[PDB]
């Protein structure tokens, strides 16, 4: 089938050693990620009452920090102030500090009530958590699910059918863009190919790669306004990037279709482009190719900022190079040899708004590939503004328009919050364009020469984001899996009692790990991992089989036909091949079967009953 | 300096220990039993094969019975067998894999064991429930445990690679005398058949007599030119064997206070690992590392059987207590009982 | 070491102070006691098959 299906609760004993070598076992590290937080409450909420009512009032500021308006926030502040806090006290049941208690009421009793008003107690509910409650959720099936769910992640191996496509969406240059259904969950996404025959031919590897680097560094923190990517793959043929989906088109296309934009409509993107542009500059990355090309609108009308393969990662060394289309460039970025930042997108904005409210560039009059007629209107020509703008938008075009950095929005202060209060924006509320509330002006209506020196340029491009990957199961299939495979293991633990279950045979000696592996004489038998030996069974016996650590002269991983797998050279000149299900089961029995034997043979070696003599 | 204003009394006392044992030596055994008849040819065969461990035997010991013996196994397991029908009495898992060694409790009610966890380890064989269970961990040793025996069901004799042995007091769990002499691991031990005395066997290449009550080295033997493996008495409790990496098992006698014999041949290269008596002392069974139990004419010195059943080495034997048969474990993981 | 050669020393004390027998005597005495319990050892004398429990005996308690 094409659907998830989770690895049977056994798996802990070896992803729980993966993790805990990364320092992946942490309260922080797992109550982090979108799944971990999941189980963790679901653990906290029904089987630890201690943990209850700090995991309910966690939520019950999560829930507060959104809330829109004041009066809003007025009101359920009181709300958490009686429950969570006079109640537990009046209880003698409320382990938090004086501090924490005088800190809220403080500013309750002056009716000052901003969203982070309750960041004092999110701090000592996580210390709260953190402790024993934290550890005896690692003892629990919660836990024991968050390491199912993570070996899926650890082993996602994507190819095309792993997806269902369903129309083309664009041609680029390279490639073209798609639309698709991802099997997994049901997700919709677009799909960007590129051929490495085309990418050769028409010389752009570094403008592919960059897009790639560049579009990891953003698409973290689930950014409305930036298309953002979940995945890329590779095929001996074509590169893909799995990326938001975008049905309605770019605004050069609408801005053909529906003419020049009011300023009320001009407005409602520029908020949008923004808050795309202050995520990028928070990650040091310019995109030096604000456009309205390069603008995709959803079904909605909402928008989001596109093709990434010119921006640049500033955070090391700030570039120099003139990059971008010729209309929407700034002064900095023109100049030879001379070092700029986010500056330069500011520039590119207040061209771009400009143009979708007259037709075309401020610094371009008609002229097609004069590109240098647009350079020297950009540098001595402050542009002109007719009457019918207003004063509000004057000085804000004015602003972003400056030729000296020294003296534009968003360089000297403080980024992107200085555009935001012009007053132009006066009358937006940017949690209200962040959360996408504001209305959209515009509804979209119905719609030969490949070498082996050139695919190791393409190893390390295959990526998953996590943020992303389990973002998509918790909005789709995870609540059904979950309770599925519940179901399945009680009705196993519900066989296993009439077919005399094992009581557990890892139990109560000195097991380092244990699980499934295949081997050969392939043959699907349970492993037992043991100071001085590897024993194994088939299912209803125990293991009449082993393989001593003595024996082992060493642990190679080996290619078996398309297909990674162990290889324990043995004593005898005799070899042994084991097969495990995913790419951190094998990492783990490769790392802990040469540390068990290397170990094991240090020790034989010291007594005099166990080691070989002449 | 000082030291070897006394060095040089301790390599003097050990001349005058010398000279009065050369005194006593005024025949040898083997011109003593020159004269009576050779035992001929001992042919026994494997009447048995136990079957149960998944890897190499380290150490075996029959209960009092005759009848049910003990195992220890680099599988982590103990196995208590019925040697007259092939059953098993009892697998136990153990707590840590690195067993070396095991005995059987003349009550026939407890099990030891232990090894690399520096512990002996005693099960309870009849619990009050009816499971098998540990019933106390005797820790105290600083190295790994290579032999132990009950005295009865409250006390034990362990002998360690820090190179001292210990009675212990199995409720107390504590030493309640150390024997401290040998400047090796000690390998082995054997009870005098009174339980009054004991004889321990060390790769300093010497066995010591020692006394249970008082805490005391009595007697030292030397004469191995190196690691001693085994030791075991002779049943009238006035001498015992040993038997050695240097090829040779050989006969001490405790109030003669030395060697009587050895027994050895060029053709006998491998070292021995485990040794004991007929019923009656006459005969010596001795296991070896090239996968044989030798058969030796105790009073004599001659060869008179081989024991040709494993496939690796023999790593320990016992004869019953009522002489009916002999129990040889292997490196091969079987055990074979002969007669 | 200082006090490792004294407790050396008086070790040896005891053990050169037993009284000993000569090895004719010791050799005499385990000839002997061999030849008393021969007919006891049944490896060296046979038992009926019928007793032995590895042979052929068939009642067991």
Redesign the interface.
């Known amino acids: 089938s094409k659907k998830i299906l989770l690895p049977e609760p056994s798996i802990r004993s070896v992803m729980q050693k993966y993790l805990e070598d990364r320092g992946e076992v942490t309260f922080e590290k797992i109550f982090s990620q979108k799944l971990g937080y999941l189980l963790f409450r679901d653990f906290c909420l029904k089987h630890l009452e201690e943990a209850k009512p700090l995991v309910e009032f966690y939520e019950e500021i999560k829930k507060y920090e959104k809330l829109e308006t004041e009066e809003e926030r007025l009101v359920c502040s009181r709300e958490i102030f009686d429950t969570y806090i006079m109640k537990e006290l009046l209880a003698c049941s409320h382990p938090f500090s004086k501090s924490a208690i005088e800190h809220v009421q403080g500013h309750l009793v002056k009716k000052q009530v901003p969203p982070d008003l309750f960041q004092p107690y999110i701090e000592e509910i996580c210390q709260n958590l953190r402790g024993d409650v934290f550890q005896k959720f690692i003892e629990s099936d919660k836990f024991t699910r968050f390491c199912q769910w993570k070996n899926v992640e650890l082993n996602i191996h994507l190819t095309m059918n792993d997806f269902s496509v369903h129309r083309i969406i664009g041609r680029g240059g390279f490639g073209e863009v798609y639309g698709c259904r991802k099997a997994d969950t049901g997700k919709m996404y677009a799909m960007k190919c590129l051929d490495k025959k085309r990418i050769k031919m028409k010389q752009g590897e570094t403008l592919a790669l960059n897009e790639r680097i560049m579009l990891s560094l953003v698409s973290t923190g689930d950014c409305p306004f930036i298309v953002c990517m979940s995945y890329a793959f590779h095929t001996p043929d074509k590169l893909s990037f799995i990326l938001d989906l975008m049905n309605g088109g770019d605004l050069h296309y609408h801005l053909s279709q529906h003419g020049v934009f009011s300023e009320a409509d001009m407005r409602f993107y520029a908020a949008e482009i923004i808050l795309g542009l202050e995520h990028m500059h928070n990650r040091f990355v310019v995109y030096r190719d604000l456009k309205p090309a390069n603008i995709l609108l959803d079904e909605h009308g909402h928008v989001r900022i596109s093709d990434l393969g010119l921006a640049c990662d500033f955070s090391k060394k700030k570039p120099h190079a003139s990059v971008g289309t010729h209309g929407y460039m700034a002064p900095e970025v023109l100049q030879k040899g001379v070092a700029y930042d986010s500056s330069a997108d500011w520039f590119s904005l207040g061209c771009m708004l400009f143009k979708l409210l007259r037709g075309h560039s401020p610094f371009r009059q008609h002229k097609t590939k004069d590109k240098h007629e647009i350079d020297r209107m950009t540098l001595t020509m402050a542009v002109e503004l007719p009457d019918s703008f207003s004063p509000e938008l004057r000085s804000l075009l004015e602003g972003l328009l400056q030729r000296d950095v020294n003296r534009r929005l968003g360089c000297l202060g403080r980024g992107a919050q200085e555009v935001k209060e012009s007053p132009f924006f006066r009358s937006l509320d940017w949690q209200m364009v962040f959360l996408q509330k504001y209305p959209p002006p515009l509804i979209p209506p119905r719609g030969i020469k490949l070498l082996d020196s050139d695919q190791e340029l393409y190893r390390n491009f295959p990526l998953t984001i996590s943020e992303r990957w389990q973002q998509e199961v918790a909005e789709t299939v995870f609540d059904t899996i979950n309770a599925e495979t519940d179901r399945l293991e009680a009705r196993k633990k519900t066989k296993n009692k009439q077919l005399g279950h094992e009581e557990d045979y890892a139990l109560?000696?000195?097991c380092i790990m244990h699980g499934y592996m295949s081997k050969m004489g392939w043959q699907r038998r349970y492993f037992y991992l043991?100071?001085?030996?590897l024993?194994w069974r088939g299912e209803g016996e125990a293991?009449?089989?082993?393989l001593?650590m003595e024996e082992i002269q060493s642990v190679e991983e080996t290619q078996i036909k398309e297909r990674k797998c162990l290889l324990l050279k043995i004593r005898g000149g005799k070899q042994f091949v084991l097969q495990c299900d995913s790419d951190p089961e094998l990492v783990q029995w490769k790392k802990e079967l040469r540390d068990a034997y290397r170990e094991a043979q240090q020790?034989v070696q010291r007594?005099?009953?166990?080691k070989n003599?002449? | 300096s000082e030291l070897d204003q006394l060095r040089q009394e301790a390599e003097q006392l050990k001349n005058q220990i010398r000279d009065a044992r050369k005194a006593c030596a005024d025949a040898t055994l083997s011109q003593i039993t020159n004269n009576i008849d050779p035992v001929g040819r001992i042919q026994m065969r494997t009447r048995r094969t136990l079957r149960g461990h998944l890897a190499k035997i380290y150490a075996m010991h029959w209960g009092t019975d005759s009848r049910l013996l003990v195992s220890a196994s680099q599988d982590g397991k103990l196995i208590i067998w019925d040697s007259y029908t092939t059953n098993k009495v009892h697998a136990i898992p153990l707590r840590s894999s690195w067993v070396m060694t095991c005995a059987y409790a003349p009550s026939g009610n407890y099990v030891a064991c232990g090894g690399l966890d520096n512990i002996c380890s005693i099960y309870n064989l009849k619990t009050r429930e009816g499971n098998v269970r540990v019933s106390r961990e005797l820790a105290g040793h600083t190295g790994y445990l290579s032999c132990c025996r009950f005295l009865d069901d409250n006390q034990i004799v362990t002998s360690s690679g820090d190179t001292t042995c210990a009675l212990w007091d199995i409720e107390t769990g504590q030493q309640t005398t150390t024997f401290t002499g040998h400047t090796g691991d000690v390998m082995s031990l054997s009870l005098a058949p009174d339980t009054r005395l004991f004889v321990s066997g060390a790769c300093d290449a010497s066995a010591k007599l020692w006394d249970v009550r008082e805490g005391m080295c009595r007697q030292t033997f030397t004469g191995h030119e190196s690691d001693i493996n085994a030791i075991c008495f002779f049943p009238n409790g006035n001498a015992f064997a040993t038997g050695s990496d240097d090829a040779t098992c050989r006969l001490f006698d405790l109030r003669a206070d030395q060697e009587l014999m050895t027994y050895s041949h060029d053709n006998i290269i491998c070292g021995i690992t485990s040794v004991s008596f007929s019923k009656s002392g006459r005969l010596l069974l001795a296991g070896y590392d090239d996968f044989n139990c030798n058969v030796w004419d105790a009073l004599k010195a001659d060869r008179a059987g081989v024991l040709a059943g494993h496939d690796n080495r023999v790593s320990c034997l016992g004869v019953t207590d009522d002489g009916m048969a002999v129990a040889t474990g292997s490196w091969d993981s079987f055990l074979k009982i002969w007669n | 070491s200082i006090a490792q050669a004294r407790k050396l020393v008086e070790q040896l004390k005891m053990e050169a102070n037993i009284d000993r027998i000569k090895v004719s005597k010791a050799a005499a005495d385990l000839m002997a006691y061999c030849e008393a319990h021969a007919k006891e050892d049944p490896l060296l004398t046979p038992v009926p098959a019928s007793e032995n429990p590895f042979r052929e005996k068939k009642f067991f308690c």
Do not use: Y
């Not at chain 1, 043991?530 to 030996?533: E, G, L, Q, S, V």
């Not at chain 1, 007594?607 to 166990?610: A, D, E, L, S, T």
């Open positions: 109560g000696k000195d043991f100071p001085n030996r024993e293991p009449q089989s082993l001593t020790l007594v005099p009953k166990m003599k002449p």
